[PDB]
Design a protein around this ligand. Structure first.
Ligand SMILES: *CC(=O)NCC1CCN(C(=O)C2(Nc3ccc(Cl)cc3)CCC(F)(F)CC2)CC1
Ligand SMILES: *CC(=O)NCC1CCN(C(=O)C2(Nc3ccc(Cl)cc3)CCC(F)(F)CC2)CC1
Ligand SMILES: [Mg+2]
Ligand SMILES: [Mg+2]
Ligand SMILES: [Mg+2]
Ligand SMILES: [Mg+2]
Ligand SMILES: [Mg+2]
Ligand SMILES: [Mg+2]
Lengths: 5, 236, 236, 5
């Protein structure tokens, strides 16, 4: 899963 | 609300303790109580709010994905019928997730966003609004799925417009917003090209502004730039 | 209870799903519902029950220790007064922990232990009784602390007596009981010599019986033997 | 902290 902040 | 009798400062103190104890549900409840005092939030307090709910919903999303995968496998050819339990439990987790998202969206709507006039606060809250509509979109399957997706898009877009006018390209909030909006494009809006273009342009424009920064600001900006690069590597 | 309307088999199915999703609070609630159906538990079901509550109370104990350490630091010379919040929040976590312990002890008392006639089930439940009184003892400071400690000791001792009569020295339940009772001696009863003697004798008697075991039983027994050795290394 | 099961 892609990076989010 | 159960936190109505507790001092604002005590709720903030306890949110910090809850974070140290990795008690994110408690952290979120404390911060909800603090927001409901009605005063605007400082930067640090906005961070506590976001960290608390990110961690609560993050755990719910991970659980939902586990359950959804089991459910999908159950609906494959040759899979033995095991009754309604997998769907029921996925639905239970889903409903709890939607509840948390609705709670956060409710705090933003009543009345954090409307009182947020500085770019840094308003962008931060609008990013959160996009994020929690995005989480709703991840589990949406019905009549409103398009409207939920559009709500996320609209919140992100307003945040992007303010960020580009008011913040430098290295600002961590601007960077984090762009990171997440890019993920929205890739994962929710079926727009991988838009996702990749946004991540690349954001990275490159930040790179060009690093020279203006102190060592500590450089560290903050480059950490999020690396997340942009990580996603680009995943997607290309 | 909220699980009263759900089938026993569905509760067990959902406990297994909750475990896969790392939703240990849900897992524990499902298993409580299953116990309250009134039927005895199979081995697998006893394991689900124990895993669920071990994980819930384990997280509460870790949080309590973080908070207790902050509280102790606040009571040191030269520490600035920060008000009642640290004590209050430690108390909140403590009360929730005690509640979980009381719930487990209640299931054991009504009516798991009394219906458990086979050594493997009765020892398993008595070990749990010792464990949850031990967790109560970890946070006890009042008039009843001695009685709580003695309740843990008594439950462990009855389990040990049955285990030694009825189970081989490599049996994983016998081993796990001895591991935990040894920790009780070291951490709760201020009896490090008893802790060390128990761990050593248990290890050595198991070693001598490994020759009787299949490969799979050998693997199970030696894993817990290594935990005994790990504790002995910590304590010597 | 010591090992328990
Ligand atoms: C009040 C305010 O301006 N907050 C922005 C901070 C938040 C923390 N931060 C970060 O770089 C990390 N988190 C983050 C969260 C949200 C947004 Cl919009 C950007 C950045 C800190 C934790 C992390 F995991 F390393 C990700 C970045 C600085 C900006
Ligand atoms: C029904 C029954 O006989 N259960 C005993 C099993 C439990 C699992 N097991 C283990 O060796 C481990 N857990 C454990 C739990 C409680 C007791 Cl009394 C002994 C052992 C499996 C997980 C672990 F983390 F690796 C520790 C050992 C076999 C015996
Ligand atoms: Mg006040
Ligand atoms: Mg639903
Ligand atoms: Mg654009
Ligand atoms: Mg029935
Ligand atoms: Mg107390
Ligand atoms: Mg003895």
């Amino acid at each position: 899963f892609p990076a989010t902040v | 609300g159960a936190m109505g009798s507790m001092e604002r400062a005590s709720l903030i103190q306890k949110a910090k303790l809850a974070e140290q104890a990795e008690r994110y549900e408690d952290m979120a409840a404390f911060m909800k109580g603090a927001v409901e005092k009605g005063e605007e939030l400082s930067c640090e307090e906005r961070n506590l709010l976001s960290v608390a709910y990110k961690n609560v919903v993050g755990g719910q999303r991970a659980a939902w994905r586990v359950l959804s995968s089991i459910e999908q496998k159950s609906n494959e050819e040759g899979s033995e019928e095991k009754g309604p339990e997998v769907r029921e439990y996925r639905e239970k987790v889903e409903t709890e997730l939607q509840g948390v998202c609705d709670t956060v969206l409710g705090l933003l709507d009543s009345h954090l966003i409307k009182e947020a006039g500085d770019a840094e606060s308003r962008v931060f809250y609008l990013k959160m609004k996009g994020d929690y509509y995005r989480y709703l979109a991840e589990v949406a399957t019905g009549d409103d799925k398009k409207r939920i997706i559009d709500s996320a898009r609209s919140a992100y877009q307003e945040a992007m417009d303010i960020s580009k006018k008011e913040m430098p390209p290295t600002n961590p909030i601007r960077l984090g917003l762009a990171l997440n909006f890019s993920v929205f494009h890739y994962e929710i809006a079926n727009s991988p090209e838009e996702a990749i273009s946004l991540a690349k342009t954001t990275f490159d424009e930040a790179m060009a502004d690093l020279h203006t920064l102190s060592e500590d600001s450089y560290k903050d900006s480059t950490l999020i730039m690396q997340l942009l690069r990580d996603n680009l590597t995943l997607w290309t």
